[PDB]
């Protein structure tokens, strides 16, 4: 929606950050996600819109991106200390059909080589895109550590058959004003992505991954 | 045709008066009903008995359109317009 004097979200973020670790000092699982449900739009009758609105603020540090690439980016991935893959390894992955549906679950994402990604379309077969894990390409001269940071901090709004899109927009760690900036950026991106720029958005909720009863949005 | 969405050109704002950086979008249009003098005149001429009273054009010959770019200054927020030739496919990659 058109923005609505975000002190209510400020008090909601303060109540959420006093819910996490000040009434339940649990183990380190900080992810203050924003769930947004849209109203007054038909999925089949309207266009299924999508975009990615990558904010550099990060909240999910433990991620799995099995870098699939060639030899030079394999050495670059071994330098960047992340789980890589080889060409014969990916050939065996396309050989065993049950291994792909499991490697899509043991990983959290993916990051491909601008020299082998125009094949993951067919070699690494379907259900990777159905699990929404189509790999993003990385060039022969871009920074692999920076690309891994971007693929860990890149959020994407996609219109499915349901109107209940939720995104890991923040962590419950700290930085109230930076969290307010993140909430403003996410609300701006959703409002600009929807067809009517204000009217369609109905439900906004904050939850710090703990089934907390503090939304107040 | 491909045009990038960033461009350094001259802006004539009173603060800048030099070459600055702009971002690029495409131009579109609107309309108005209980406002404009032409519509308010046409509706009264159209009411009553008499028929249609104005011409109606149905002999279109062009198949394409010129494209206009709107440039917004990042340091001034002063827009500017620039027209291009006739093309069939346009994007801002």
């Amino acid at each position: 929606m058109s923005k609505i004097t975000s002190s209510q979200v400020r008090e909601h973020v303060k109540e959420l950050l006093k819910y996490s670790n000040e009434t339940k000092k649990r183990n380190f699982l900080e992810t203050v996600e924003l769930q947004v449900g849209l109203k007054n739009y038909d999925p089949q009758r309207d266009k299924r819109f999508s975009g990615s609105l990558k904010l550099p603020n990060c909240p999910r540090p433990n991620m799995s991106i099995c870098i699939f690439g060639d030899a030079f980016d394999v050495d670059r991935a071994k330098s960047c200390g992340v789980d890589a893959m080889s060409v014969d390894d990916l050939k065996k992955l396309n050989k065993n059909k049950k291994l792909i549906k499991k490697l899509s679950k043991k990983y959290n994402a993916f990051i491909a080589s601008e020299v082998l990604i125009k094949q993951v379309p067919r070699l690494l077969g379907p259900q990777l895109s159905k699990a929404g894990k189509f790999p993003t390409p990385v060039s022969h001269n871009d920074d692999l550590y920076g690309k891994v940071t971007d693929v860990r901090s890149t959020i994407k709004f996609q219109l499915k058959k349901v109107l209940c899109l939720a995104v890991a927009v923040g962590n419950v760690e700290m930085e109230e004003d930076v969290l307010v900036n993140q909430i403003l950026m996410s609300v701006n991106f959703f409002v600009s992505l929807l067809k009517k720029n204000w009217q369609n958005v109905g439900s906004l909720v904050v939850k710090s991954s703990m089934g907390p009863a503090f939304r107040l949005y | 045709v491909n045009v990038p969405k960033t461009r350094k050109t001259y802006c004539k704002g009173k603060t800048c008066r030099k070459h600055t950086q702009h971002k690029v979008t495409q131009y579109k249009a609107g309309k108005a009903s209980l406002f404009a003098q032409g519509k308010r005149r046409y509706d009264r001429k159209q009411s009553g008995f008499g028929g249609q009273t104005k011409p109606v054009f149905h002999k279109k010959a062009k198949t394409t359109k010129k494209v206009v770019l709107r440039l917004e200054c990042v340091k001034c927020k002063t827009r500017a317009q620039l027209t291009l030739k006739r093309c069939k496919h346009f994007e801002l990659g």
Partner: protein, 427 residues
């Protein structure tokens, strides 16, 4: 480009999810697996449904239009590497260790291989299988009349079976020599070859080019084409070598004792070079830049000893006089300078006492005794004086010690950096 035409798509695995999750209680009386496969295919092979029987009288796994139509039709009508585990075992049975050779003839007349219904790339990969066997040792080969006018499938056998000694290939069907022309310096130690009743063996060149094809041949088709009694002493060494020898056995014992003592002391701390050498006992040190043949086993490619080159008193290395005069050894002070010039290295002689090879002798001009030992010297640590560090590198000490009642006193103190490889001690 790369792996492209793997065929993981085009109706094989993708777009196979058009199923319909309805009430699933279809008309189903008898549709089980064996009778279904029999009533579907009595003339060819077929591809079956996902999960379709009539055991529970319910079926909804006909995930396509023609699948659902055939299911409704039979509802409305009443009805009712992997070859390596045998190939390598056959090859290991063919490599009898008693005869020390394998026979690969007449495989196209053996029912264990005729009904298997498979030859050229099979034998060219069977060379790789026989090289990766490594425990079914076979020296010679017996593959007469192998149904080839050329030698394509037996081309890599010369590289894979480099201990060839004989071959019987008679009743051949070859009419050229260019297929055998690649066998120069390849299976050239073999000493018997005959492929008669053929246009490759009944030609003129069979006595002038066969010796070139096998220079080391002590026989030629149940004959002798070379002086095989003298070839063992002319084409090879006349006598063996001695990995440890001296003028006397007790001389070699004391020489090896003082050599191991000096090597252990130089490994622990060489700070007492001034106390090990006298005022006259000088030294020398040099490095070996160039290397031997590239096919030498575990051979250092280049002398990576770039922190010891300035104090190398080598004659033909540097062209100056004052440079070798400054890099050369005076008494105890410059002896300790040469001792701390190079990289300190614990002696790899106690691991391979065999490869630590030491000769010895006496010195009649001073009633002394000399010992030239040579071993490895692997340097974990280096010289603390200011590509940089060492590599796999050897060393050789040619000392000349004159004994007394107390101990022995050195006269020559040599240092030699080299390129490490295998030693001439082993068999």
């Amino acid at each position: 480009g790369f792996h492209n035409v793997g065929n993981i798509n085009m109706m094989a695995q993708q777009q196979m999810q058009q199923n319909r999750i309805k009430i699933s209680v279809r008309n189903w009386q008898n549709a089980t697996m064996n009778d279904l496969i029999n009533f579907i295919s009595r003339n060819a092979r077929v591809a079956v449904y996902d999960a379709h029987v009539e055991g529970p009288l319910v079926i909804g796994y006909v995930n396509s239009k023609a699948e659902a139509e055939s299911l409704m039709k039979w509802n409305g009508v009443r009805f009712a590497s992997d070859t390596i585990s045998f190939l390598r075992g056959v090859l290991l049975k063919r490599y009898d260790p008693q005869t020390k050779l394998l026979n690969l003839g007449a495989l196209h007349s053996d029912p264990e291989l005729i009904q298997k219904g498979v030859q050229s790339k099979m034998f060219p990969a069977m060379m790789k299988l026989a090289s990766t066997e490594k425990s079914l040792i076979v020296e010679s080969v017996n593959l007469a009349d192998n149904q080839l006018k050329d030698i394509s499938a037996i081309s890599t056998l010369a590289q894979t079976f480099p201990n060839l000694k004989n071959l019987c290939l008679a009743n051949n069907q070859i009419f050229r020599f260019r297929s055998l022309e690649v066998w120069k310096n390849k299976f050239k130690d073999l000493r018997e070859l005959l492929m008669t009743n053929n246009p490759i063996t009944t030609d003129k060149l069979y006595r002038t080019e066969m010796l070139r094809l096998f220079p080391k041949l002590v026989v030629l088709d149940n004959v002798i084409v070379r002086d095989e009694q003298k070839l063992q002493t002319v084409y090879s060494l006349p006598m063996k070598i001695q990995q440890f020898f001296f003028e006397n056995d007790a001389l070699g014992q004391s020489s090896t004792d003082f050599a191991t003592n000096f090597l252990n002391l130089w490994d622990n701390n060489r700070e007492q070079l001034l106390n090990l050498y006298s005022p006259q006992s000088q030294f020398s040190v040099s490095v070996d830049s160039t290397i031997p043949p590239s096919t030498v086993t575990d051979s250092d490619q280049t002398p990576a000893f770039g922190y010891y080159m300035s104090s190398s008193r080598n004659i033909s290395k540097v062209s100056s006089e004052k440079s070798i005069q400054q890099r050369l050894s005076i008494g105890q002070e410059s002896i300790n300078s040469i001792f701390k010039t190079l990289p300190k290295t614990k002696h790899h002689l106690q691991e391979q006492p065999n490869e630590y090879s030491m000769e010895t002798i006496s010195y009649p001009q001073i009633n002394g005794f000399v010992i030239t030992l040579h071993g490895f010297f692997e340097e974990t640590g280096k010289p603390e004086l200011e590509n940089n560090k060492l590599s796999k590198k050897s060393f050789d000490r040619t000392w000349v010690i004159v004994p007394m009642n107390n101990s022995v006193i050195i006269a020559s103190d040599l240092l030699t950096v080299r390129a490490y490889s295998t030693g001439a001690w082993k068999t």
